[PDB]
Enzyme design. Sequence first.
Site, PDB file in Angstrom:
ATOM      1  N   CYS B 106     -46.957  14.587  16.529  1.00 40.16           N
ATOM      2  CA  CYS B 106     -45.878  15.213  15.766  1.00 40.16           C
ATOM      3  C   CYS B 106     -46.369  16.266  14.790  1.00 40.16           C
ATOM      4  CB  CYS B 106     -45.068  14.145  15.000  1.00 40.16           C
ATOM      5  SG  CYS B 106     -43.812  14.844  13.905  1.00 40.16           S
ATOM      6  N   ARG B 109     -45.139  16.317  10.423  1.00 41.06           N
ATOM      7  CA  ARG B 109     -45.419  15.168   9.553  1.00 41.06           C
ATOM      8  C   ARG B 109     -45.581  15.456   8.051  1.00 41.06           C
ATOM      9  NH1 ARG B 109     -50.360  12.481  12.369  1.00 41.06           N
ATOM     10  NH2 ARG B 109     -50.488  14.462  13.560  1.00 41.06           N
ATOM     11  N   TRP B 278     -35.456  17.732  12.529  1.00 49.39           N
ATOM     12  CA  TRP B 278     -34.804  18.976  12.929  1.00 49.39           C
ATOM     13  C   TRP B 278     -35.723  19.675  13.904  1.00 49.39           C
ATOM     14  CZ3 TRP B 278     -35.684  17.971   7.686  1.00 49.39           C
ATOM     15  CH2 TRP B 278     -36.887  18.478   7.171  1.00 49.39           C
ATOM     16  N   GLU B 283     -39.094  24.243  21.024  1.00 49.76           N
ATOM     17  CA  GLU B 283     -38.645  23.095  21.801  1.00 49.76           C
ATOM     18  C   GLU B 283     -37.465  23.471  22.690  1.00 49.76           C
ATOM     19  OE1 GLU B 283     -38.720  19.133  19.734  1.00 49.76           O
ATOM     20  OE2 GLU B 283     -38.766  20.431  17.945  1.00 49.76           O
TER      21      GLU B 283
HETATM   22  C1  HEM Z   1     -38.297  16.738  10.278  1.00 47.85           C
HETATM   23  C2  HEM Z   1     -38.758  17.649  11.140  1.00 47.85           C
HETATM   24  C3  HEM Z   1     -39.571  17.312  12.417  1.00 47.85           C
HETATM   25  C4  HEM Z   1     -40.150  18.251  13.175  1.00 47.85           C
HETATM   26  C5  HEM Z   1     -40.119  19.781  12.916  1.00 47.85           C
HETATM   27  C6  HEM Z   1     -40.807  17.588  14.278  1.00 47.85           C
HETATM   28  C7  HEM Z   1     -41.513  18.215  15.273  1.00 47.85           C
HETATM   29  C8  HEM Z   1     -41.949  17.617  16.430  1.00 47.85           C
HETATM   30  C9  HEM Z   1     -42.265  18.283  17.684  1.00 47.85           C
HETATM   31  C10 HEM Z   1     -42.155  19.800  17.977  1.00 47.85           C
HETATM   32  C11 HEM Z   1     -42.677  17.346  18.543  1.00 47.85           C
HETATM   33  C12 HEM Z   1     -43.084  17.558  20.015  1.00 47.85           C
HETATM   34  C13 HEM Z   1     -41.875  17.020  20.799  1.00 47.85           C
HETATM   35  C14 HEM Z   1     -41.862  17.478  22.233  1.00 47.85           C
HETATM   36  O1  HEM Z   1     -42.555  18.478  22.549  1.00 47.85           O
HETATM   37  O2  HEM Z   1     -41.148  16.842  23.053  1.00 47.85           O
HETATM   38  C15 HEM Z   1     -42.633  16.062  17.875  1.00 47.85           C
HETATM   39  C16 HEM Z   1     -42.997  14.858  18.429  1.00 47.85           C
HETATM   40  C17 HEM Z   1     -42.890  13.622  17.840  1.00 47.85           C
HETATM   41  N1  HEM Z   1     -42.284  13.351  16.609  1.00 47.85           N
HETATM   42 FE1  HEM Z   1     -41.831  14.797  15.175  1.00 47.85          FE
HETATM   43  N2  HEM Z   1     -40.622  16.220  14.164  1.00 47.85           N
HETATM   44  C18 HEM Z   1     -39.851  16.011  13.032  1.00 47.85           C
HETATM   45  C19 HEM Z   1     -39.435  14.759  12.606  1.00 47.85           C
HETATM   46  C20 HEM Z   1     -39.882  13.544  13.094  1.00 47.85           C
HETATM   47  C21 HEM Z   1     -39.482  12.240  12.592  1.00 47.85           C
HETATM   48  C22 HEM Z   1     -38.458  12.039  11.445  1.00 47.85           C
HETATM   49  C23 HEM Z   1     -40.136  11.309  13.310  1.00 47.85           C
HETATM   50  C24 HEM Z   1     -40.090   9.766  13.176  1.00 47.85           C
HETATM   51  C25 HEM Z   1     -39.504   9.122  12.158  1.00 47.85           C
HETATM   52  C26 HEM Z   1     -40.972  11.995  14.287  1.00 47.85           C
HETATM   53  C27 HEM Z   1     -41.813  11.388  15.200  1.00 47.85           C
HETATM   54  C28 HEM Z   1     -42.336  11.984  16.328  1.00 47.85           C
HETATM   55  C29 HEM Z   1     -43.014  11.296  17.403  1.00 47.85           C
HETATM   56  C30 HEM Z   1     -43.322   9.784  17.549  1.00 47.85           C
HETATM   57  C31 HEM Z   1     -43.397  12.390  18.391  1.00 47.85           C
HETATM   58  C32 HEM Z   1     -44.108  12.177  19.738  1.00 47.85           C
HETATM   59  C33 HEM Z   1     -42.880  11.967  20.614  1.00 47.85           C
HETATM   60  C34 HEM Z   1     -43.290  11.743  22.032  1.00 47.85           C
HETATM   61  O3  HEM Z   1     -44.469  11.349  22.245  1.00 47.85           O
HETATM   62  O4  HEM Z   1     -42.419  11.966  22.921  1.00 47.85           O
HETATM   63  N3  HEM Z   1     -40.787  13.351  14.128  1.00 47.85           N
HETATM   64  N4  HEM Z   1     -42.186  16.267  16.585  1.00 47.85           N
HETATM   65  C1  LIG Z   2     -41.843  14.605  27.518  1.00 51.92           C
HETATM   66  N1  LIG Z   2     -40.749  14.892  26.580  1.00 51.92           N
HETATM   67  C2  LIG Z   2     -39.451  14.616  27.227  1.00 51.92           C
HETATM   68  C3  LIG Z   2     -38.331  14.665  26.187  1.00 51.92           C
HETATM   69  C4  LIG Z   2     -38.375  15.953  25.374  1.00 51.92           C
HETATM   70  C5  LIG Z   2     -37.298  15.924  24.312  1.00 51.92           C
HETATM   71  C6  LIG Z   2     -35.959  16.109  24.660  1.00 51.92           C
HETATM   72  C7  LIG Z   2     -34.968  16.078  23.680  1.00 51.92           C
HETATM   73  F1  LIG Z   2     -33.681  16.263  24.019  1.00 51.92           F
HETATM   74  C8  LIG Z   2     -35.317  15.863  22.353  1.00 51.92           C
HETATM   75  C9  LIG Z   2     -36.651  15.678  21.997  1.00 51.92           C
HETATM   76  C10 LIG Z   2     -36.970  15.437  20.541  1.00 51.92           C
HETATM   77  C11 LIG Z   2     -38.402  15.755  20.129  1.00 51.92           C
HETATM   78  C12 LIG Z   2     -38.244  15.859  18.628  1.00 51.92           C
HETATM   79  C13 LIG Z   2     -38.009  14.724  17.862  1.00 51.92           C
HETATM   80  C14 LIG Z   2     -37.841  14.837  16.489  1.00 51.92           C
HETATM   81  C15 LIG Z   2     -37.584  13.588  15.667  1.00 51.92           C
HETATM   82  C16 LIG Z   2     -37.904  16.099  15.902  1.00 51.92           C
HETATM   83  C17 LIG Z   2     -38.142  17.217  16.713  1.00 51.92           C
HETATM   84  N2  LIG Z   2     -38.223  18.477  16.211  1.00 51.92           N
HETATM   85  N3  LIG Z   2     -38.289  17.066  18.042  1.00 51.92           N
HETATM   86  C18 LIG Z   2     -37.642  15.703  22.978  1.00 51.92           C
END
Ligand code: HEM
Ligand SMILES: CNCCCc1cc(F)cc(CCc2cc(C)cc(N)n2)c1
Lengths: 411, 407
Positions: B106, B109, B278, B283
């Site tokens: 992520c 963070r 957000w 994405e």
């Molecule tokens: C608040 C603004 C946030 C931004 C800008 C953000 C951004 C991102 C992005 C760009 C990814 C890559 C997702 C993808 O490519 O599918 C990601 C993954 C992830 N985020 Fe964050 N995120 C945010 C909030 C959060 C929150 C609130 C949580 C948990 C409480 C979180 C937990 C995770 C986890 C566990 C992943 C890995 C997800 C996966 O392996 O599919 N994120 N985030």
């Molecule tokens: C291999 N990945 C398959 C699913 C990808 C994805 C689809 C989606 F609609 C929404 C997300 C959310 C990813 C995310 C989650 C959070 C919490 C914040 C943020 N900016 N982006 C991922």
Amino acid sequence: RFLKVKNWETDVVLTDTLHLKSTLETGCTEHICMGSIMLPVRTKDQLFPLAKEFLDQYYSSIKRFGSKAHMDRLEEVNKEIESTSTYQLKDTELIYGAKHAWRNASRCVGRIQWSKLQVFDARDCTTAHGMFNYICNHVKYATNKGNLRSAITIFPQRTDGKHDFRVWNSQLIRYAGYKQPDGSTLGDPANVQFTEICIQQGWKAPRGRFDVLPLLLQANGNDPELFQIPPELVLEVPIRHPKFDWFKDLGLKWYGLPAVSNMLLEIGGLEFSACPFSGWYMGTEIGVRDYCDNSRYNILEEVAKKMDLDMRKTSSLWKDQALVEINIAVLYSFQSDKVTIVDHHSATESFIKHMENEYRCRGGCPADWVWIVPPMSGSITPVFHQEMLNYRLTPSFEYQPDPWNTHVWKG
Amino acid sequence: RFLKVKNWETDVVLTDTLHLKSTLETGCTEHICMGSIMLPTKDQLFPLAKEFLDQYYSSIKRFGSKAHMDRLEEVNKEIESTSTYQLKDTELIYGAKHAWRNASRCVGRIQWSKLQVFDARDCTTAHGMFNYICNHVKYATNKGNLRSAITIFPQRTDGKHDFRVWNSQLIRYAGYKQPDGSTLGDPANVQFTEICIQQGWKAPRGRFDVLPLLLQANGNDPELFQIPPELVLEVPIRHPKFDWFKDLGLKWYGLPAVSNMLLEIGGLEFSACPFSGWYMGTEIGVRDYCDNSRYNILEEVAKKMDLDMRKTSSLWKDQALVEINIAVLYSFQSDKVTIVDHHSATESFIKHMENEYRCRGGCPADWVWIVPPMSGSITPVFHQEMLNYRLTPSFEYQPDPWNTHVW
Ligand code: HEM
Ligand SMILES: CNCCCc1cc(F)cc(CCc2cc(C)cc(N)n2)c1
Ligand code: HEM
Ligand SMILES: CNCCCc1cc(F)cc(CCc2cc(C)cc(N)n2)c1
Ligand SMILES: C[C@H](O)[C@H](O)[C@H]1CNc2nc(N)[nH]c(=O)c2N1
Ligand SMILES: C[C@H](O)[C@H](O)[C@H]1CNc2nc(N)[nH]c(=O)c2N1
Ligand SMILES: [Zn+2]
């Protein structure tokens, strides 16, 4: 053991068995992945199994495994090792070895070309002057008036480690960099340290933005000597843009020949510390990294200005927009001058086909995703979506310490 | 053992000590790196609880305190007796925030400590889950001024009474296999859409149909609910320069909300824990719109732009990609829906990383995921060496419920 990789765009799954032949370490453990980390004299006891492993691979490749010829060669190498503490490769083994080091290079997206490599055997070279002659010849051959040909020149192997042949340049052709008293940099900021060395060694620096560095060449462990590559052998391309007529007035150019000279070639346990190799550029190496890294020529601002993009906030994506135009210019310029270059779409698509072919015919293709994915537009290239397995096979190209840090000066 | 990471742009070297606290495995070995692979009992439970409670009590400057020891014995007593234990509200909130803090994939963070935690452990039914999720969606959305949130449903017991949100994300668009072989809507969601229809969803068969929620409580059969349309904030996509862009009929939803992951805290497992933040622009504009297996709009856009698409080296794909991403950011900003561009987000992550090294001894990060899918090396994370390792509390992948479910 079988390992599966999946392509998330196509759902194609490949099975790797080649990893069973991996040897050296990755840096990773079950507790930590070092996948994004950039960086990581030999007894007769360790040498013969290395030699034997290599010769077994060589003889299998020519369908003569277990032959009298294979057995005699092992015998001959064993005797040479116990007698002289080392051994000499046959020309056939050297060529095979060099090609496989390239085939095995996990950070190289260009490997579809691996079997087409001109090998220049320079093992009879004895002096820095001799090295200069060999390198000029490589440059002229590889350049081929713009129709680039892959090549490698191989200088004598390491003996006791006190007589190493080394090319001190990290690459055969590179531009000087100069730190100014006001802290600004003229030329290529990546090469400031090496430029200072050259100047100290007596190079008369023109002090411009694109000065080709001299060669600093070390033979047989002696102090290195300076040589200027004949300017007429250094092919360069002025950079212009097909739509933006002002782009030419940026004053940009680059050289056509990418030639890495600071790496070590390991074949059958032997170490070739001076083994300069060259291919042709992928456009992004110049247009993205050389021109747009903040720590390099760093031209994004000037270009975006001239395009009159909104630079008040990053979210206008002015940097991304300028980056594409610069990379268009590079490709356009090289093509227009008939100097071989490949775009990042073509190169990655070719790599995927190469990789799939290797899985079928070889059981795998070690690859480092971090380096294979291009530095712009990553996910609109197929390699982004391709799972990869990184492991180390020999023969191989390895990093080695910079010679200025380890060299014992004769004076 | 004590590990150095270097930034190749700035030469700044950082020293990681936090990795020694890692516990789960990477999939990598000394012989092979799997860094690019996407998916690599009372006895078990108490050391997991202790490890967590120790870090919790350390965090509140009360390590070795009587309250610390008292808590330890209480949980231990509760585990022997009941086979499991219940987290205090303070521990649950700490755990959820730290799960986000520990999420190596992520980039967002820097925000980890500002997470609204909704305790839904009193939920018993699927209608109850629906109510809680609507409230989460409304809170998180906040009329476009997005706020990070997580809603946490009852923890796993015997594994036969799992709460699950069957949807992979709270808000997504349906996908339909068309007669003429093509795909209508989001191709990524074709199979899940079929399960919804199977369960009785009346599909509108359009291009951007918001999927219904399929909610499972207490290991019971999943039930269907439709999120009130007025709570799903969406953004029509237009371009600031190209007047024709609006004609593509593109839109996306404002709330990214992951609902298929498992939250592990103190050895306890929360199989239903939807969380939201957000969006980062890429994405939507890079992956959702331009992946070939997704909406795959590159060709159409390039054509409207009248680019030479005869050869790759004109970089027509790259040009159209940039413009699509400009449109996404512009549309969200114009409608006052929180979004961050990849430059701002990665710059924030570098600063977060430096805070974490300075105050925690490190920050586990997956470079393959952290680097944005466009313009990689013009973002600072490209040049930043990162160490990837697994810390707990954590968010984990888990099997899709339809493969698991004894109907
Ligand atoms: C608040 C603004 C946030 C931004 C800008 C953000 C951004 C991102 C992005 C760009 C990814 C890559 C997702 C993808 O490519 O599918 C990601 C993954 C992830 N985020 Fe964050 N995120 C945010 C909030 C959060 C929150 C609130 C949580 C948990 C409480 C979180 C937990 C995770 C986890 C566990 C992943 C890995 C997800 C996966 O392996 O599919 N994120 N985030
Ligand atoms: C291999 N990945 C398959 C699913 C990808 C994805 C689809 C989606 F609609 C929404 C997300 C959310 C990813 C995310 C989650 C959070 C919490 C914040 C943020 N900016 N982006 C991922
Ligand atoms: C023929 C066309 C070739 C292309 C298009 C190509 C492409 C590339 C690119 C883009 C990189 C990354 C370079 C960087 O980011 O600094 C690379 C790395 C590498 N290439 Fe190739 N290459 C070619 C030929 C060769 C040849 C002939 C050899 C050796 C005989 C070779 C061996 C390597 C090695 C060892 C690396 C890793 C370099 C490092 O770690 O710094 N390549 N290649
Ligand atoms: C961290 N790396 C620092 C040095 C990068 C580099 C500089 C250079 F001048 C020339 C190259 C050439 C790399 C290369 C080598 C070859 C053989 C082909 C090809 N397309 N590219 C790299
Ligand atoms: C820190 C990271 O490993 C480093 O910046 C890498 C990323 N990927 C790369 N990929 C290529 N092809 N060349 C590079 O120099 C780098 N640098
Ligand atoms: C094969 C590779 O691991 C896969 O395509 C990854 C690459 N990096 C990613 N990075 C992010 N942020 N999201 C992703 O889905 C992916 N996909
Ligand atoms: Zn690894």
